[PDB]
Amino acid sequence: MTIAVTGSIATDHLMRFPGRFSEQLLPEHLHKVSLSFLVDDLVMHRGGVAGNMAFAIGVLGGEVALVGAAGADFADYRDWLKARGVNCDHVLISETAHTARFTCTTDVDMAQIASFYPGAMSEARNIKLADVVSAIGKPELVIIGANDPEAMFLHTEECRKLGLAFAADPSQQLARLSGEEIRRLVNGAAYLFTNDYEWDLLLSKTGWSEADVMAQIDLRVTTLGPKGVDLVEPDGTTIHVGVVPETSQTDPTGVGDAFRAGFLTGRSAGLGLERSAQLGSLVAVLVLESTGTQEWQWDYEAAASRLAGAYGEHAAAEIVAVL
Amino acid sequence: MTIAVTGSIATDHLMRFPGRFSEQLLPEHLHKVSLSFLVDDLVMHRGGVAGNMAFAIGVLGGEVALVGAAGADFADYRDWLKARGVNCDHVLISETAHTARFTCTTDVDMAQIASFYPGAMSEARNIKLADVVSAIGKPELVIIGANDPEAMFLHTEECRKLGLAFAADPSQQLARLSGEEIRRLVNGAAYLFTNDYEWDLLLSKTGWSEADVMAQIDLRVTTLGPKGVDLVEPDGTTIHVGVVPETSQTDPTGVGDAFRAGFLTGRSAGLGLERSAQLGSLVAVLVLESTGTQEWQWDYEAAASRLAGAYGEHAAAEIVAVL
Ligand SMILES: Nc1ncnc2c1ncn2[C@@H]1O[C@H](COP(=O)(O)OP(=O)(O)OP(O)(O)=S)[C@@H](O)[C@H]1O
Ligand SMILES: Nc1ncnc2c1ncn2[C@@H]1O[C@H](COP(=O)(O)OP(=O)(O)OP(O)(O)=S)[C@@H](O)[C@H]1O
Ligand code: NA
Ligand code: NA
């Protein structure tokens, strides 16, 4: 039943400046700035695409192993994930580098100053999926999430060699990879996940037609924001599922990851394509409506009720029957 | 024998950008910047003036209690200090705020973008020194380090009420406090510590003469950078001690704190003024020569040797006799 989730593990450190950055950005000092901002809030969110996906699968009660690279400062995050049933045995802990980190300071005018530190993520290229197989047997599915790029290639190649089904889930790496690199991530995938902007980017960079892609994969999953999700099979069957209506948009971060987790959890639990997309749509809206990416709650009763509103009582009952 | 060290507890998170900030600071977007820097190094240093001083006193084998406010993220820092003999029982742990943090990103041209987050430091005003006294009896000395400003006043006032000797150690808060506020921190001090710029600032903001200050305190300690330290008593005795010559200046951060720790450790161990200043000068140079503020080692043999080079074998023997 085990899904192995590969990809980035990171935290976001968000700081608020009550002033305006522009007050310190006069031309006299742009050649060598020395900016200092007294900030009045610091929020830390657990993230990375693999952390987000593993967290969600765990919360939903799926069998899941997180496979990525982090630093010694990962310990409290490990305990957090382990509390939700995530197997973290195969998280590579760097001896020298800290866990990847996004830091962002935002002022009162919503100007931002941001950095990204890859840290230990770069060591994901040293993880061998064979070591996972030795400990837990062959995963039912390996998710190839956004990561150290070399690690994405090596993991995908190892999946093919070892006969492991994989999901191509390159998300924000599509912009950075060459057309050939993207083809190499997609050939033979059990699933391809993207949003609709990324789907178009994929076709233009690779030079593939849609038919060429569908000759390579078992299922295309293309998210459409508020317009739902398209699922396309290589036989020409298409399924479209609408969203669960939201009651707020407190933070859109992590929504794609959440969709994927819910969908794949549904598939692993034996649900059909429509029902799995419905489940993914619920998890996605819970993440949309909450701060950060792993700060949402899972309430069986509220899930059943909300699913029934969006998709009818019959569909809701079919879905919660497996949770 | 117990020194209670009040003041800031913080960490420094330092990130390196291999590029130039100026490349993203064209006039077209200064009104609402969205800067993004891919950084390639992150170094975290344990600090705060009270943390630095307590660490040093502990390493030297003194009896010391750290009294300041931090967040739940203080745990690994607690264990670090406890390993060196620091009593952390009276560190107030915030339920909502993180430990104070300085974050700084530096580019290849040594331009910097920095923030300071006070966090839990602001809750130091809720610490009661009476609670320390109840647990450990009256400290021999309470250091009033740079801190939440209200906490500095409240701690000093509590010392007078409770009959506890205190060291006025306002350092970088002198620039921010009013002349009256500074007088209120200094009246009745057993010790006043500053550097020489701060000594002049103190006299000009307060309107005191040197004689007026010396009528208020038992000892003035004024550090002079590479020119050593002056110690002045209210009877008109003055002692000047030169530095221990350095072999590098890898990082000047934390040097004042280190001097204070070594000096006060010497005083608590029964050393005279000259010898205590000699000990403080050694600890100061060890911190000057090391990255960060608590990343230096303590080697009894190398200390004796280095002290003898600077001050002669007799003085070196008198000093290490108490370590
Ligand atoms: N406004 C919305 N209301 C309800 N559901 C939504 C909304 N936006 C997105 N979703 C659900 O979230 C899924 C993924 O959203 P997308 O916006 O296509 O993902 P994405 O671009 O990868 O988002 P990020 O970058 O992870 S926030 C959709 O297929 C929907 O099921
Ligand atoms: N270049 C040096 N060589 C040897 N010892 C030094 C040197 N600079 C400082 N010291 C010692 O460090 C003590 C304190 O240094 P100062 O520079 O006066 O302190 P400060 O201005 O509080 O420094 P910071 O801000 O804590 S780095 C001096 O009294 C010396 O004993
Ligand atoms: Na969110
Ligand atoms: Na230093």
XYZ file of C-alpha atoms and ligand atoms in Angstrom:
710
model
C 0.000 0.000 0.000
C 3.135 2.143 0.515
C 3.623 5.390 -1.428
C 7.218 6.649 -1.414
C 7.270 10.443 -1.746
C 10.501 11.952 -3.193
C 11.079 15.645 -3.429
C 11.984 18.724 -1.496
C 11.863 19.034 2.308
C 12.030 22.655 3.491
C 10.719 25.247 5.909
C 9.466 28.810 5.210
C 10.485 31.578 7.634
C 8.223 34.565 7.109
C 8.866 37.962 8.707
C 6.784 41.093 8.689
C 8.238 44.607 8.460
C 5.606 47.182 9.583
C 7.393 49.900 7.569
C 8.276 50.395 3.919
C 11.413 48.997 2.309
C 11.293 51.951 -0.125
C 12.247 54.324 2.724
C 15.736 52.698 2.763
C 16.111 52.416 -1.022
C 17.218 55.955 -1.996
C 19.724 56.104 -4.920
C 22.635 57.266 -2.699
C 23.347 53.709 -1.442
C 22.100 51.204 -4.071
C 25.690 50.258 -5.024
C 26.290 48.824 -1.549
C 23.151 48.716 0.556
C 23.067 48.195 4.319
C 19.347 47.742 4.967
C 18.092 46.993 8.490
C 14.471 46.128 9.227
C 13.040 45.784 12.725
C 10.415 43.114 12.103
C 7.455 42.367 14.391
C 6.356 38.847 13.420
C 8.078 35.567 12.506
C 6.036 32.576 11.298
C 7.660 29.255 10.444
C 5.840 26.767 8.188
C 6.870 23.149 7.509
C 7.030 22.494 3.759
C 8.782 21.224 0.702
C 6.648 19.392 -1.846
C 7.558 15.948 -0.481
C 6.948 16.995 3.120
C 3.531 18.452 2.178
C 2.506 15.372 0.228
C 3.739 12.932 2.888
C 2.038 14.887 5.654
C -1.284 14.779 3.777
C -1.106 11.061 2.935
C -0.273 10.322 6.581
C -3.146 12.442 7.958
C -5.552 10.598 5.626
C -4.266 7.268 6.999
C -2.284 6.092 3.981
C 0.978 4.152 4.159
C 3.713 6.596 3.231
C 7.498 6.967 3.328
C 9.213 10.354 2.939
C 12.382 10.061 0.818
C 14.430 13.279 0.599
C 17.443 15.085 2.083
C 17.404 17.347 5.139
C 19.656 18.649 7.925
C 19.999 17.830 11.611
C 17.507 20.669 12.194
C 14.883 18.320 10.676
C 14.341 16.558 14.052
C 11.174 18.372 15.234
C 9.743 18.100 11.692
C 10.489 14.337 11.790
C 8.515 13.987 15.040
C 5.650 16.009 13.521
C 5.443 13.723 10.511
C 5.973 10.533 12.523
C 2.974 11.568 14.696
C 0.862 11.392 11.505
C 2.165 7.942 10.490
C 4.844 9.034 8.007
C 7.860 6.660 7.802
C 10.911 8.987 7.861
C 13.569 6.231 8.002
C 14.812 7.088 4.492
C 15.213 10.818 4.962
C 18.913 11.410 4.386
C 20.320 13.629 7.132
C 23.252 15.785 6.056
C 26.290 15.957 8.305
C 27.115 19.515 7.194
C 24.152 21.270 5.580
C 20.931 22.581 7.098
C 17.462 21.751 5.880
C 16.466 23.820 2.828
C 14.935 27.135 3.747
C 12.923 29.896 2.167
C 13.121 33.177 4.079
C 10.876 36.107 3.155
C 10.369 39.547 4.645
C 7.278 41.477 3.549
C 6.585 45.185 4.215
C 3.326 47.106 4.689
C 3.141 47.752 0.916
C 3.542 44.007 0.215
C 7.038 44.479 -1.197
C 9.146 41.377 -0.519
C 12.771 40.424 0.006
C 13.297 36.692 -0.246
C 16.031 34.134 -0.268
C 16.202 30.434 -0.934
C 18.864 28.232 0.649
C 19.010 24.726 -0.911
C 21.149 23.295 1.868
C 20.839 19.552 2.316
C 18.410 19.241 -0.643
C 21.438 18.922 -2.922
C 22.347 15.656 -1.197
C 19.131 13.938 -2.377
C 21.203 12.747 -5.360
C 22.872 10.344 -2.893
C 19.684 8.554 -1.885
C 19.276 5.043 -3.357
C 15.695 3.850 -3.758
C 17.087 0.295 -3.538
C 17.609 0.977 0.190
C 13.888 1.746 0.528
C 12.987 -1.472 -1.259
C 15.296 -3.445 1.034
C 13.537 -2.095 4.137
C 9.867 -1.995 3.030
C 9.636 -3.919 -0.281
C 8.546 -2.317 -3.526
C 6.431 0.809 -3.051
C 3.110 0.724 -4.927
C 4.090 4.171 -6.243
C 7.066 6.526 -6.091
C 6.225 10.253 -6.464
C 9.023 12.164 -8.288
C 8.405 15.622 -6.872
C 10.318 18.820 -7.445
C 13.795 18.334 -5.911
C 17.467 18.662 -6.562
C 17.332 18.216 -10.338
C 19.959 15.462 -10.515
C 18.030 13.575 -7.832
C 14.854 13.779 -9.942
C 16.625 12.103 -12.872
C 18.378 9.519 -10.740
C 15.188 8.559 -8.893
C 13.155 8.249 -12.098
C 15.906 6.128 -13.712
C 16.071 3.922 -10.590
C 12.318 3.414 -10.666
C 12.506 2.126 -14.238
C 15.453 -0.161 -13.417
C 13.768 -1.529 -10.335
C 10.257 -1.873 -11.838
C 8.638 0.699 -9.589
C 5.600 2.646 -10.787
C 6.266 6.388 -10.639
C 4.398 9.676 -10.791
C 6.112 12.488 -12.710
C 5.412 15.581 -10.652
C 7.987 18.183 -11.748
C 5.859 21.285 -10.994
C 8.097 24.365 -10.708
C 11.134 22.567 -12.131
C 9.519 22.542 -15.587
C 10.608 26.138 -16.127
C 14.236 25.256 -15.349
C 14.651 21.930 -17.207
C 15.450 21.445 -20.870
C 12.973 19.809 -23.275
C 15.101 16.619 -23.259
C 15.316 16.610 -19.488
C 11.524 16.889 -19.254
C 11.065 13.994 -21.673
C 13.388 11.941 -19.491
C 11.240 12.608 -16.420
C 7.984 11.695 -18.221
C 8.677 8.524 -20.289
C 6.946 5.567 -18.704
C 5.192 7.403 -15.911
C 2.149 5.866 -14.303
C 0.925 9.406 -13.650
C 1.827 12.897 -14.912
C 0.706 15.747 -12.661
C 0.804 19.414 -13.621
C -1.370 22.476 -13.576
C -2.651 23.856 -16.833
C 0.084 26.505 -17.332
C 2.685 23.772 -16.757
C 0.944 21.391 -19.189
C 1.233 23.947 -21.931
C 4.867 24.651 -20.925
C 5.608 20.910 -21.032
C 4.270 20.520 -24.568
C 6.117 23.592 -25.854
C 9.514 22.762 -24.308
C 9.434 19.061 -25.196
C 7.962 19.571 -28.668
C 5.555 16.734 -27.942
C 1.980 16.666 -29.066
C -0.647 15.571 -26.565
C -0.906 12.221 -28.409
C 2.851 11.696 -28.062
C 2.647 12.292 -24.309
C -0.293 9.945 -23.921
C 1.676 7.207 -25.718
C 4.211 7.524 -22.817
C 2.109 7.572 -19.672
C -0.857 5.851 -18.047
C -2.751 8.940 -16.840
C -2.500 12.687 -17.290
C -3.775 14.753 -14.336
C -4.062 18.472 -15.109
C -5.276 20.807 -12.438
C -7.286 23.897 -13.458
C -7.427 26.068 -10.334
C -10.973 27.032 -9.527
C -12.148 25.172 -12.641
C -11.279 21.754 -11.195
C -9.229 18.946 -12.716
C -8.964 16.983 -15.966
C -7.904 13.322 -15.953
C -7.033 11.860 -19.343
C -6.290 8.202 -20.207
C -4.316 6.917 -23.216
C -7.448 5.238 -24.636
C -9.060 8.700 -25.042
C -11.270 8.614 -21.928
C -11.451 11.988 -20.191
C -12.863 12.797 -16.769
C -13.453 16.298 -15.475
C -14.185 16.970 -11.767
C -15.131 20.371 -10.309
C -13.823 21.858 -7.109
C -15.155 21.818 -3.614
C -16.376 25.419 -3.147
C -14.121 27.373 -0.790
C -15.302 29.570 2.123
C -12.078 31.631 2.155
C -8.685 31.752 0.415
C -6.541 32.333 3.481
C -3.398 30.898 1.764
C -3.179 29.196 -1.726
C 0.260 27.755 -0.943
C 0.454 23.925 -0.946
C -2.796 23.330 -2.824
C -1.298 21.301 -5.673
C 0.571 19.085 -3.216
C -2.627 18.545 -1.224
C -4.579 17.633 -4.363
C -1.978 15.059 -5.300
C -1.918 13.553 -1.843
C -5.682 13.211 -1.624
C -5.973 11.831 -5.164
C -3.229 9.264 -4.741
C -4.482 8.294 -1.301
C -7.846 7.638 -2.930
C -6.210 5.550 -5.679
C -4.195 3.507 -3.187
C -7.393 2.884 -1.177
C -9.079 1.485 -4.308
C -11.210 4.427 -5.379
C -11.977 5.139 -9.006
C -10.700 8.144 -10.923
C -13.710 10.412 -10.267
C -13.872 9.615 -6.564
C -10.122 9.992 -6.116
C -10.275 13.420 -7.773
C -13.164 14.377 -5.503
C -11.094 13.406 -2.441
C -8.108 15.335 -3.806
C -10.342 18.355 -4.336
C -11.423 18.297 -0.664
C -7.879 18.096 0.649
C -6.878 20.880 -1.744
C -9.608 23.226 -0.404
C -8.658 22.494 3.237
C -5.107 23.594 2.422
C -6.351 26.643 0.427
C -8.328 27.740 3.497
C -5.466 27.415 5.969
C -2.230 29.239 6.666
C 0.823 27.475 5.314
C 0.689 23.958 3.900
C 0.498 21.550 6.850
C -1.550 23.674 9.274
C -5.004 22.257 8.381
C -7.047 19.746 10.357
C -8.665 16.514 9.267
C -12.246 16.053 10.465
C -14.006 12.903 9.183
C -17.528 14.321 9.855
C -16.867 17.719 8.258
C -15.231 15.936 5.283
C -18.304 13.763 4.680
C -20.591 16.803 4.935
C -18.518 18.974 2.607
C -18.087 16.188 0.058
C -21.843 15.671 0.012
C -22.446 19.387 -0.681
C -20.073 19.383 -3.612
C -20.649 15.964 -5.104
C -23.803 14.418 -3.569
C -24.396 12.016 -0.677
C -23.665 8.881 -2.736
C -20.230 10.040 -3.826
C -19.433 11.340 -0.340
C -20.338 7.934 1.167
C -18.165 6.075 -1.374
C -15.191 8.289 -0.474
C -15.348 8.262 3.323
C -15.995 4.467 3.183
C -12.213 4.168 2.638
C -11.016 6.727 5.238
C 29.497 32.261 44.040
C 26.527 32.547 41.635
C 26.444 35.253 38.946
C 22.976 35.848 37.489
C 23.267 37.092 33.900
C 20.277 39.130 32.588
C 20.031 40.300 29.039
C 19.265 39.254 25.524
C 19.161 35.642 24.290
C 19.222 35.390 20.485
C 20.587 33.569 17.467
C 22.180 35.001 14.279
C 21.241 33.415 10.936
C 23.778 34.454 8.327
C 23.320 33.786 4.606
C 25.657 34.385 1.721
C 24.523 35.581 -1.715
C 27.283 34.896 -4.308
C 25.869 37.652 -6.554
C 25.274 41.374 -6.186
C 22.143 42.858 -4.642
C 22.672 45.915 -6.886
C 21.737 43.816 -9.949
C 18.128 43.680 -8.617
C 17.980 47.302 -7.430
C 17.244 49.194 -10.682
C 14.957 52.268 -10.267
C 12.015 50.650 -12.132
C 10.923 48.633 -9.052
C 12.124 50.462 -5.897
C 8.537 51.458 -4.983
C 7.591 47.803 -4.498
C 10.564 45.476 -4.709
C 10.356 41.706 -5.133
C 13.973 40.656 -4.610
C 14.926 36.963 -4.677
C 18.404 35.735 -3.785
C 19.567 32.149 -4.225
C 21.992 31.882 -1.318
C 24.721 29.239 -0.967
C 25.580 29.233 2.747
C 23.651 29.468 6.031
C 25.508 29.738 9.356
C 23.669 29.898 12.670
C 25.415 31.321 15.755
C 24.131 31.188 19.351
C 24.163 34.668 20.904
C 22.515 37.464 22.773
C 24.649 39.303 25.317
C 23.364 37.226 28.247
C 23.821 33.947 26.382
C 27.403 34.921 25.433
C 28.290 35.974 28.961
C 26.683 32.917 30.579
C 28.358 30.573 28.115
C 31.774 32.080 28.904
C 31.338 32.009 32.694
C 30.208 28.376 32.450
C 33.153 27.315 30.249
C 35.543 28.919 32.767
C 33.892 26.895 35.561
C 32.021 29.694 37.315
C 28.602 29.329 38.932
C 26.150 31.049 36.619
C 22.413 31.365 35.987
C 21.020 32.706 32.697
C 17.984 34.954 33.298
C 16.234 36.118 30.107
C 13.293 35.375 27.795
C 13.322 32.967 24.853
C 11.010 30.779 22.756
C 10.357 27.047 22.611
C 13.036 26.960 19.888
C 15.546 27.636 22.707
C 15.714 23.901 23.609
C 18.939 22.929 21.771
C 20.571 26.166 23.006
C 19.504 25.223 26.570
C 21.224 21.831 26.232
C 24.343 23.546 24.843
C 24.554 25.885 27.813
C 23.625 23.212 30.362
C 26.551 21.109 29.021
C 28.846 23.971 30.121
C 27.325 24.228 33.621
C 24.918 27.119 33.005
C 21.732 26.997 35.152
C 18.891 27.761 32.687
C 16.006 27.183 35.140
C 15.074 30.888 35.101
C 14.959 31.371 31.353
C 11.369 32.385 30.679
C 9.977 30.386 27.761
C 7.315 32.196 25.751
C 4.161 30.321 24.828
C 3.715 32.326 21.610
C 6.916 34.060 20.508
C 10.129 32.638 19.077
C 13.588 33.321 20.410
C 14.955 36.688 19.231
C 16.697 36.472 15.901
C 19.035 38.498 13.756
C 18.989 37.461 10.098
C 21.531 38.873 7.642
C 22.227 38.223 3.981
C 25.537 39.488 2.591
C 26.495 39.684 -1.112
C 29.866 39.415 -2.871
C 30.354 43.202 -2.549
C 29.685 43.008 1.219
C 26.341 44.782 0.882
C 23.938 43.554 3.573
C 20.219 43.122 4.125
C 19.396 42.507 7.761
C 16.464 42.140 10.058
C 16.024 41.902 13.789
C 13.087 40.064 15.350
C 12.748 40.736 19.115
C 10.318 37.885 19.669
C 10.279 36.519 23.196
C 12.863 39.098 24.389
C 9.976 41.480 25.063
C 8.682 39.099 27.733
C 11.811 39.551 29.897
C 9.847 42.321 31.652
C 7.822 39.497 33.253
C 10.774 37.819 34.943
C 10.979 38.357 38.728
C 14.465 38.153 40.217
C 12.766 37.197 43.507
C 12.059 33.804 41.889
C 15.801 33.348 41.307
C 16.543 34.220 44.920
C 13.930 31.721 46.106
C 15.588 28.901 44.148
C 19.318 29.684 44.568
C 19.603 32.399 47.264
C 21.036 35.831 46.591
C 23.372 35.950 43.591
C 26.790 37.462 44.357
C 26.194 39.650 41.286
C 23.425 40.326 38.777
C 24.600 41.518 35.323
C 22.100 43.980 33.743
C 22.914 43.397 30.090
C 21.320 44.886 27.015
C 17.721 43.580 26.876
C 14.141 44.599 26.478
C 14.486 48.129 27.855
C 11.654 47.857 30.388
C 13.235 44.643 31.674
C 16.548 46.463 32.208
C 14.839 49.039 34.438
C 12.737 46.502 36.291
C 15.705 44.213 36.971
C 17.911 47.065 38.200
C 15.103 48.343 40.468
C 14.547 44.806 41.816
C 18.240 44.439 42.573
C 18.180 47.595 44.691
C 15.002 46.497 46.504
C 16.359 43.045 47.173
C 19.920 44.117 48.109
C 21.599 42.429 45.173
C 24.863 43.801 43.787
C 24.507 44.621 40.090
C 26.653 45.406 37.073
C 25.313 48.086 34.717
C 26.135 46.787 31.264
C 23.867 48.694 28.851
C 26.196 48.536 25.807
C 24.213 49.195 22.611
C 21.134 50.391 24.502
C 22.966 53.589 25.489
C 22.223 55.074 22.075
C 18.490 54.416 22.497
C 17.918 55.441 26.144
C 17.324 58.932 27.468
C 19.806 60.651 29.809
C 17.420 60.043 32.748
C 16.957 56.415 31.808
C 20.735 55.935 31.730
C 21.106 57.533 35.158
C 18.479 55.124 36.448
C 20.469 52.136 35.184
C 23.748 53.379 36.727
C 22.926 54.669 40.259
C 24.293 52.274 42.838
C 26.009 49.871 40.487
C 28.797 47.687 41.774
C 30.271 47.810 38.272
C 29.753 49.951 35.151
C 30.960 48.371 31.912
C 31.237 50.195 28.599
C 33.654 50.708 25.771
C 35.259 54.083 25.329
C 32.796 55.438 22.712
C 29.941 54.440 25.040
C 31.631 56.067 28.059
C 31.740 59.361 26.249
C 28.121 58.866 25.080
C 27.074 58.126 28.673
C 28.605 61.336 30.015
C 27.113 63.479 27.243
C 23.564 62.071 27.438
C 23.389 62.027 31.241
C 25.124 65.382 31.706
C 27.229 63.789 34.426
C 30.851 64.558 35.006
C 33.206 61.652 35.617
C 33.301 62.602 39.329
C 29.499 62.457 39.504
C 29.506 58.956 38.010
C 32.204 57.765 40.376
C 30.133 59.005 43.338
C 27.448 56.493 42.146
C 29.335 53.287 41.459
C 32.032 51.048 42.915
C 34.097 50.470 39.754
C 34.194 51.832 36.227
C 35.442 49.370 33.583
C 36.093 50.993 30.198
C 37.321 48.874 27.359
C 39.648 50.438 24.758
C 39.767 47.932 21.895
C 43.321 47.086 20.996
C 44.536 49.546 23.644
C 43.288 47.394 26.531
C 41.112 48.357 29.487
C 40.897 51.046 32.172
C 39.533 50.236 35.639
C 38.765 53.234 37.835
C 37.775 53.246 41.535
C 35.902 56.010 43.393
C 38.967 56.711 45.574
C 40.889 57.805 42.435
C 42.874 54.588 41.891
C 43.226 53.710 38.212
C 44.472 50.479 36.674
C 45.270 50.026 33.009
C 45.811 46.542 31.488
C 46.943 45.877 27.902
C 45.557 43.254 25.585
C 46.648 39.754 24.846
C 48.136 40.071 21.329
C 45.904 38.457 18.709
C 47.072 36.073 15.940
C 44.040 36.814 13.728
C 40.790 38.812 13.819
C 38.506 36.171 12.356
C 35.373 37.749 13.962
C 35.241 40.729 16.458
C 31.648 39.914 17.431
C 31.131 39.006 21.120
C 34.436 40.402 22.375
C 32.963 42.791 24.943
C 30.756 40.038 26.353
C 33.758 37.712 26.591
C 35.828 40.359 28.379
C 33.086 40.862 30.928
C 32.671 37.161 31.523
C 36.371 36.548 32.047
C 36.776 39.611 34.278
C 33.803 38.813 36.473
C 34.740 35.147 36.641
C 38.136 36.278 37.900
C 36.514 38.568 40.492
C 34.174 35.835 41.716
C 37.169 33.471 42.031
C 38.933 36.016 44.270
C 41.371 37.584 41.832
C 42.432 41.196 42.093
C 41.543 43.885 39.580
C 44.684 43.545 37.423
C 44.535 39.759 37.287
C 40.808 39.735 36.564
C 41.359 42.153 33.672
C 44.164 39.947 32.375
C 41.822 36.927 32.418
C 39.106 38.966 30.695
C 41.618 40.021 28.055
C 42.445 36.366 27.272
C 38.818 35.348 26.907
C 38.216 38.419 24.743
C 41.041 37.462 22.323
C 39.794 33.846 22.066
C 36.410 35.200 20.971
C 38.037 37.762 18.601
C 39.894 34.893 16.909
C 36.857 32.666 16.422
C 33.748 32.709 14.274
C 30.653 33.846 16.112
C 30.581 34.350 19.872
C 30.374 30.899 21.480
C 32.430 28.897 18.961
C 35.803 29.125 20.779
C 37.492 26.434 22.852
C 38.899 26.569 26.352
C 42.341 24.997 26.737
C 43.908 25.324 30.215
C 47.486 24.720 28.909
C 47.222 27.142 25.977
C 45.641 29.724 28.331
C 48.552 29.521 30.782
C 51.065 29.817 27.932
C 49.342 32.768 26.273
C 48.845 34.594 29.570
C 52.539 34.195 30.328
C 53.499 35.713 26.948
C 51.332 38.747 27.522
C 51.713 39.312 31.234
C 54.617 37.187 32.556
C 54.813 33.760 34.200
C 53.956 35.053 37.692
C 50.711 36.678 36.616
C 49.800 33.691 34.443
C 50.312 31.333 37.421
C 48.161 33.523 39.705
C 45.333 33.441 37.146
C 45.236 29.750 36.241
C 45.567 28.913 39.987
C 41.818 29.687 40.162
C 40.674 27.895 36.965
N -10.440 28.548 -5.798
C -10.554 27.218 -5.590
N -11.621 26.663 -4.998
C -11.706 25.348 -4.739
N -10.756 24.461 -5.116
C -9.638 24.911 -5.707
C -9.458 26.337 -5.984
N -8.265 26.503 -6.595
C -7.736 25.259 -6.677
N -8.550 24.324 -6.170
C -8.320 22.869 -6.120
O -6.905 22.732 -6.139
C -6.457 21.991 -7.252
C -5.058 22.480 -7.644
O -5.046 23.905 -7.838
P -4.150 24.615 -8.923
O -4.301 26.088 -8.643
O -4.420 24.170 -10.361
O -2.726 24.010 -8.422
P -1.272 24.695 -8.465
O -1.164 25.738 -9.522
O -0.283 23.574 -8.447
O -1.362 25.423 -7.027
P -0.149 25.727 -5.985
O 0.981 26.367 -6.730
O 0.189 24.339 -5.331
S -1.008 26.996 -4.627
C -7.585 22.157 -8.273
O -7.538 21.133 -9.271
C -8.828 22.163 -7.370
O -9.297 20.853 -6.991
N 42.673 43.893 18.571
C 42.660 43.361 19.813
N 43.636 42.563 20.273
C 43.592 41.988 21.485
N 42.597 42.218 22.373
C 41.562 42.992 22.011
C 41.522 43.621 20.690
N 40.390 44.353 20.602
C 39.764 44.175 21.790
N 40.461 43.390 22.622
C 40.106 43.009 24.000
O 38.689 43.114 24.045
C 38.254 44.048 25.007
C 36.931 44.664 24.540
O 37.052 45.198 23.209
P 36.293 46.494 22.733
O 36.549 46.567 21.250
O 36.618 47.753 23.538
O 34.793 45.983 23.100
P 33.408 46.314 22.353
O 33.458 47.597 21.600
O 32.329 46.109 23.367
O 33.465 45.093 21.299
P 32.216 44.262 20.667
O 31.195 45.233 20.159
O 31.719 43.322 21.824
S 33.087 43.184 19.160
C 39.457 44.979 25.175
O 39.389 45.700 26.408
C 40.634 44.003 25.026
O 40.965 43.280 26.229
Na -2.514 27.050 2.499
Na 34.120 36.182 17.441
